[PDB]
């Protein structure tokens, strides 16, 4: 069981990292803008918050995986 759950944790960590990369790319694109469309102004904040949430989730997952080890 231990090995299977460790593998599942690894898969979840990989998925979280894959999400972080795309969100960081989108925020990197949106930052350069100078007079963004009103919708983009809200979308930038939404992505900024989602990045933080994903980073804490990644931290928690890695901590749990290390704890099992």
């Amino acid at each position: 069981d231990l090995k299977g759950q460790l593998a599942k944790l690894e898969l979840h960590l990989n998925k979280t990292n894959g999400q972080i990369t795309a969100t960081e790319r989108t925020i990197n694109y949106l930052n350069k803008l100078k007079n963004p469309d009103p919708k983009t102004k809200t979308q930038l904040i939404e992505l900024t918050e989602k990045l933080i949430k994903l980073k804490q989730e990644f931290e928690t997952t890695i901590n749990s995986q290390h704890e099992i080890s």
């Binding site: 894959g18 999400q19 990369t21 795309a22 790319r25 989108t26 990197n28 694109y29 350069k32 469309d37 919708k39 983009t40 809200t42 979308q43």
Partner: protein, 370 residues
Amino acid sequence: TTALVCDNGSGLVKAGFAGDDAPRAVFPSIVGRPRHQGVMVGMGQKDSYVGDEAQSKRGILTLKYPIEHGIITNWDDMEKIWHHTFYNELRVAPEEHPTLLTEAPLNPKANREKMTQIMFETFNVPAMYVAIQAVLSLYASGRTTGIVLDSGDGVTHNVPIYEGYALPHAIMRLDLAGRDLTDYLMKILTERGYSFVTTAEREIVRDIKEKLCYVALDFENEMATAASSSSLEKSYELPDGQVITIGNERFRCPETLFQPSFIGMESAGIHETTYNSIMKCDIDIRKDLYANNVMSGGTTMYPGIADRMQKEITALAPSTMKIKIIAPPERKYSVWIGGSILASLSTFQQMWITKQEYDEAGPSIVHRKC
């Protein structure tokens, strides 16, 4: 919902979902048809293999490419590729999600209409959009002012943009790409004795190209060094347990990019096209385009292409002005990485072409924004 972002290319098919960092599936765009009789009973007959299984069984198949030079030549085989991508590879019904496609600039109009019809009447997607390959690169790069240099298989094009105002008169298009390099590699490998003729042998030569090639900083000096000594030699192994030994041909294949007179063509090398595109814009914006150059496409992965490009452009361009070649890693997927970002944007979610809009307005709809 998630919107598929497929990139029907000239030599590979990359399909995935929005909000990701890599295509979900990637596989060659070929169709293989059996060549021989077939003697065993029970095997169950198949008319034509498509995708990666065809590449697996290339021994007894006649591989054909539905696309060439960006244009689509054979349609019944391009539809088979799309069906395989949607059902077998991605494993998602196409009805629920919209779709985004990419088409090279200056292509024939009819292509766009036919693609639209095949994507509405037959597959029944609720909304489809098509974008220029070069533009999507700039989202992935992360800037707005630049001159992209997308060089896929089949064709290579330059599209300069400034403050998000694409200049349409400066766009340049050229038909030099990986396929011609593979053919030249076959032709020059003929000299040492190694003869490759069939299509599968061309597939082997393409792998030889991918693994063992590089671009010399200078050409004549490299030829002199290779002739005098024997240090620029590499050994490669065929599927038949035979050993090829390549010498000069390591850097005579990509060199045709900068000297198109090797294949008998007449146009100028890629550096001259980039310089001409830059010098065809207005006077006030040339400095910014010089500063921020961008590379994309697989063909621009040869070790040492960035350095030679920078050297040639610096030699061609006036002094006092700084040139950089933004050539990030993983440029291979750069175009696709753009599309997903473009799908994500909230504003863009208003720009699709709904099915009823195409039903009412007609085929011309797509060309209104062309």
